[PDB]
RNA sequence: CCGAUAGUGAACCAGUACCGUGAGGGAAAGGUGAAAAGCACCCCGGAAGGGGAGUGAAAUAGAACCUGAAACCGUGUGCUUACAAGUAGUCAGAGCCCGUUAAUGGGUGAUGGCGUGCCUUUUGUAGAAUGAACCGGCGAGUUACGAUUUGAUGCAAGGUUA
RNA sequence: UAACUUGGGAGUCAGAACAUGGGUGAUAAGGUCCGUGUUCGAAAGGGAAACAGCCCAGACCACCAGCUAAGGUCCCAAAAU
RNA sequence: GACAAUGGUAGGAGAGCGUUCUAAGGGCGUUGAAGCAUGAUCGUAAGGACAUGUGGAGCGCUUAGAAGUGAGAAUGCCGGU
């Protein structure tokens, strides 16, 4: 059928996450769990949680099975932007952007 | 067998059953206009001729007498303060053919 | 009574930008650039209508001469043959004739060649 | 806009011709030839496409030059490195790679467009009196000189 | 020193046809029934590179 | 007369935070819904966050809560693109696809012709002279008194009030 | 078919090239200073390869009609090898 | 119906569109206002209706009057990207 799950205000930029997604989009679940769960980065824990969480809600609420579950689409969008500033020479400043994110996964089975 | 006619200041090729557009004639719908100037009719019995081949008459129906697509005019000189803009539609008259030369 | 100048500006700017559909990069989203590119467009039209008339006169002449090289009647001998014959038509009909039917054109050239 | 015949890739015809190069001069030839390949001299001419014909040219070597410009007509390219100019050859190129000579002498009477460079590929020159392309049932052709 | 021009939305993307990252090596376990990476250890259950030789 | 970049600088915990040794200078920041009825309960999760279930007419109104544009960023997809010299469009136009505020239709566009941005200042600028990173907002001939002429209007050798 | 007066309102006072009679300068200058006239400036379009001023000519709008001007007719690039 | 004119900066004259508010008249609005978005529509232009979606309470129209009445550019202020 359809299924999804979300994470919001996650304290990572979009891009660094977006690469990791481009290792995902199209696969089957089990594989993608593995793919995330091995690569040594900071996003892999998070996406792993959100993915398996999505399978959780799909299982409990919608009563699916796990074989045919595939990643229909996934994408991360921009979030609030905690402006900071690091000092710098000659009496000046420079405003860092501590970025955020809103991760979106939509697990699907494809059938009814 | 087709023939060549005159209208406005220009000409058209017509085969019988064909449609045409042309600048306005100011003759309402269904009032079948009949041309009087013709310049050529070929095919089988070929008759090229003097201007206004005589004995030659076309008939046709006035389907629609509408208006055109509003093209924009616009233009300007550069680095100066000048410009202009004024649309212009066009009237036309839409005919199809019965009875190539009488 | 102060006047919030809003509520029109955006609308005007949409009436511009929506004449920028098919333009490249940031020319189809931004007001400024699409304004000035539009103005180039309208001007270009105002020379292009003229230009198409010039063009198709060239084209028709080209095709016609490509016909009358068959009888080795270079294009000018012909036309002078036509003004002398006491007949005259446009171009584009010599084109469509000499494209869709050959024989008719041949009979024209006979009618003109014999006036020289 | 109104009626007039235009020409497509499917409303088309293309042919393969022979031309003797011997006993003939270079100007007259290249002009008339690229007056073929350009699509001119056909009443289906439409210049947003290629009604370009094909042409075969045989026995280039016997072409001839009037006056000097046997030798005092120099050809120049540049190798894009500095001081890499080359007068390296002259009209003696007729002796060696004469086919190249013609094939550049025509491809300057054509534009640099994408079309114009497609036409020029529809030419095949042979300084020798043989050709492989007889499969096409090619024709002869008579120039006006 | 500096750019003179604005780097448009195309070239910023074409330039990024190579920040992708490679599909890492993978294979199922020989008797731990799951995936891991090649010429490496499982991290589970008892370690299985040829079978258990470790605890962690 | 203004209706949150206006109007007190200040609609809110402002002469505050802040800056400066000090005189002193000086901010940004309104809105859930009718009523708090402000998400019991299950599930993943360490949490946060979320999917469900429910309150409510509506929760894509769920607290960073009316409306939610543009820049900007993405996900997918109809068309198209790897011998090609491009102020980027326009004109002509095949091919492929689609069907409208139903009319000389709309989306894309192989290929050809044609074509050196905008304002300012200038004898003249593609200009290698200047300004603009984009977009949203703001923002510049006003008012009194008086003279003068123009047009109108009422009276008329009279007219007019402070 | 314009000319004059009165009244209201301004703008302009840095001009350039081409030809032409001249001064200066070296019978030098895309020079400078004057008279004379044109065009540009405030005017596009066709030709001069390309171009503010040279040459033909003064755009109300639209047409897939025609005849001509300067300049051109082998290909590029329409038109007489 | 004829005849003729209709390039144009500085600049002079004239007719005009829309916004906010007011006065008067006449009208619309949960059986969904305004705004917003989309659209292949009308007008010579500035511009205006219409259909649909979102939106959740005020708005248009005719006549005339007064204006803080229009913004692409200030090495412009602010905000966001
Ligand atoms: Mg507000
Ligand atoms: Mg201006
Ligand atoms: Mg100067
Ligand atoms: Mg701005």
From Swiss-Prot, chain B:
Keyword annotations: Ribonucleoprotein, Ribosomal protein, RNA-binding, rRNA-binding
Subunit details: Part of the 50S ribosomal subunit. Contacts protein L20.
Transmembrane helix in keyword set: no
UniProt-listed GO biological process terms: translation
GO cellular component, one term: cytoplasm
Bias (Basic residues) ranges: 80-91
Function: This protein binds to 23S rRNA in the presence of protein L20.
Gene Ontology MF: a single term: structural constituent of ribosome
Region Disordered, annotated ranges: 80-102
Organism (species): Staphylococcus aureus (strain NCTC 8325 / PS 47)
Gene (name only): rplU
Lineage top rank: taxon: Bacteria
Coiled coil regions, renumbered to chain: none
Family statement drawn from the similarity comment of this UniProt entry: Belongs to the bacterial ribosomal protein bL21 family.
Name of the protein: Large ribosomal subunit protein bL21
InterPro entries given in the database record: bL21-like, bL21-like_sf, Ribosomal_bL21
UniProtKB/Swiss-Prot annotation, chain C:
Xref: CDD domains: Ribosomal_L20
GO terms for biological process, alphabetical: ribosomal large subunit assembly; translation
Transmembrane residue ranges: none
Gene Ontology MF annotations: rRNA binding; structural constituent of ribosome
Keywords: Ribonucleoprotein, Ribosomal protein, RNA-binding, rRNA-binding
Superkingdom to which the source organism belongs: Bacteria
Residue pairs linked by disulfide bridges in the UniProt entry: none
One GO term describing the cellular component: cytosolic large ribosomal subunit
Recorded family membership: Belongs to the bacterial ribosomal protein bL20 family.
HAMAP family assigned to the protein according to its UniProt record, in alphabetical order: Ribosomal_bL20
Function: Binds directly to 23S ribosomal RNA and is necessary for the in vitro assembly process of the 50S ribosomal subunit. It is not involved in the protein synthesizing functions of that subunit.
Protein name: Large ribosomal subunit protein bL20
Taxonomic lineage from the root: Bacteria, Bacillati, Bacillota, Bacilli, Bacillales
Swiss-Prot record, chain D:
UniProt keyword annotations, A-Z: Ribonucleoprotein, Ribosomal protein
GO molecular function: mRNA binding; structural constituent of ribosome
Cellular component GO terms, alphabetical: cytosolic large ribosomal subunit; ribosome
InterPro entries named among the record's database cross-references: Ribosomal_uL13 (IPR005822), Ribosomal_uL13_bac-type (IPR005823), Ribosomal_uL13_CS (IPR023563), Ribosomal_uL13_sf (IPR036899)
GO biological processes: negative regulation of translation; translation
UniProt superkingdom: Bacteria
Database matches in NCBIfam families: rplM_bact
Subunit relationships: Part of the 50S ribosomal subunit.
Family statement: Belongs to the universal ribosomal protein uL13 family.
Summary of the function given for this chain in its UniProt record: This protein is one of the early assembly proteins of the 50S ribosomal subunit, although it is not seen to bind rRNA by itself. It is important during the early stages of 50S assembly.
Name assigned to this protein: Large ribosomal subunit protein uL13
Gene label: rplM
Swiss-Prot record, chain E:
Gene Ontology molecular function: structural constituent of ribosome
Keywords, alphabetical: Ribonucleoprotein, Ribosomal protein
Superkingdom field: Bacteria
UniProt keyword annotation of Aminoacyl-tRNA synthetase present: no
Gene3D superfamilies linked to this entry: Single helix bin
Record GO biological process: translation
Keyword Cytoplasm (UniProt): no
One cellular-component annotation, GO: large ribosomal subunit
Matches recorded under PANTHER family: 50S RIBOSOMAL PROTEIN L32 (PTHR35534), LARGE RIBOSOMAL SUBUNIT PROTEIN BL32 (PTHR35534:SF2)
Stated family: Belongs to the bacterial ribosomal protein bL32 family.
Protein name: Large ribosomal subunit protein bL32
Natural source organism: Staphylococcus aureus (strain NCTC 8325 / PS 47)
Lineage, opening ranks: Bacteria, Bacillati, Bacillota, Bacilli, Bacillales
Gene expressing this chain: rpmF
């Amino acid at each position: 059928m359809e299924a999804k799950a979300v994470a919001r205000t996650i304290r990572i930029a979009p891009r660094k996450v977006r690469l990791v997604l481009d290792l995902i989009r199209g696969k089957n679940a089990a594989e993608a769990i593995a793919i995330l769960k091995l690569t040594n980065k900071a996003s892999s824990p998070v996406i792993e949680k959100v993915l398996m969480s999505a399978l959780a809600n799909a299982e409990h609420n919608y009563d699916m099975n796990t074989d045919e579950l595939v990643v229909k689409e996934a994408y991360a969008n921009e979030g609030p932007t905690l402006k900071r500033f690091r000092p710098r020479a000659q009496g000046r400043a420079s405003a860092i952007n501590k970025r955020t994110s809103h991760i979106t996964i939509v697990v699907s089975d494809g059938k009814e | 067998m087709f023939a060549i006619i005159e209208t406005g200041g220009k000409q058209i090729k017509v085969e019988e059953g064909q449609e045409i557009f042309v600048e306005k004639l100011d003759v309402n719908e269904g009032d079948t206009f009949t041309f009087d100037k013709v310049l050529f009719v070929g095919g089988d019995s070929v008759k090229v001729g003097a201007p206004t081949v005589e004995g030659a008459t076309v008939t046709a129906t006035v389907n629609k007498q509408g208006r055109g697509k509003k093209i924009t005019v616009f233009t300007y000189k550069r680095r100066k303060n000048s410009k202009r803009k004024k649309g212009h539609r066009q009237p036309y008259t839409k005919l199809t053919i019965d009875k190539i030369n009488a | 009574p102060r006047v919030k100048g809003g509520t029109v500006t955006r609308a005007r700017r949409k009436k511009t930008i929506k004449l920028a559909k098919g333009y490249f990069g940031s020319k189809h989203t931004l007001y400024k650039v699409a304004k000035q590119q539009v103005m180039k467009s309208g001007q270009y039209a105002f020379r292009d209508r003229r230009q198409r008339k010039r063009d198709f006169r060239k084209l028709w002449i080209t095709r016609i001469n490509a016909a009358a090289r068959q009888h080795e009647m270079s294009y000018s001998r012909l036309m002078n043959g036509l003004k002398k014959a006491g007949i005259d038509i446009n171009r584009k009909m010599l084109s469509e004739i000499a494209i869709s039917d050959e024989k008719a054109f041949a009979q024209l050239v006979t009618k003109a060649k014999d006036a020289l | 806009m109104r009626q007039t015949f235009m020409a497509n890739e499917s409303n088309i015809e293309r042919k393969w011709y022979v031309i003797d190069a011997e006993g003939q001069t270079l100007g007259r030839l290249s002009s008339e030839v690229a007056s073929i390949l350009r699509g001119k001299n056909k009443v289906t001419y439409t210049p947003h496409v290629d009604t370009g014909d094909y042409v075969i040219v045989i026995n280039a070597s016997k072409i001839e030059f009037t006056g000097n410009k046997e030798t005092d007509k120099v050809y120049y390219r540049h190798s894009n490195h500095p001081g890499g100019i080359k007068s390296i050859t002259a009209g003696e190129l007729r002796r060696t790679n004469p086919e190249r000579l013609i094939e550049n002498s025509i491809k300057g009477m054509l534009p640099s467009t994408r079309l114009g460079e497609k036409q020029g590929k529809k030419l095949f020159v042979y300084g020798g009196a043989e050709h492989p392309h007889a499969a096409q049932q090619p024709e002869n052709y008579e120039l006006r000189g | 020193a500096v750019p003179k021009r604005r780097t448009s939305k195309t070239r910023k993307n074409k330039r990024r046809t190579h920040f992708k990252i490679s599909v890492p090596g993978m294979t199922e376990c020989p008797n731990c029934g799951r995936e891991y990476k090649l010429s490496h250890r499982v991290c589970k259950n008892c370690g299985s590179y040829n079978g258990e030789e470790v605890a962690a």
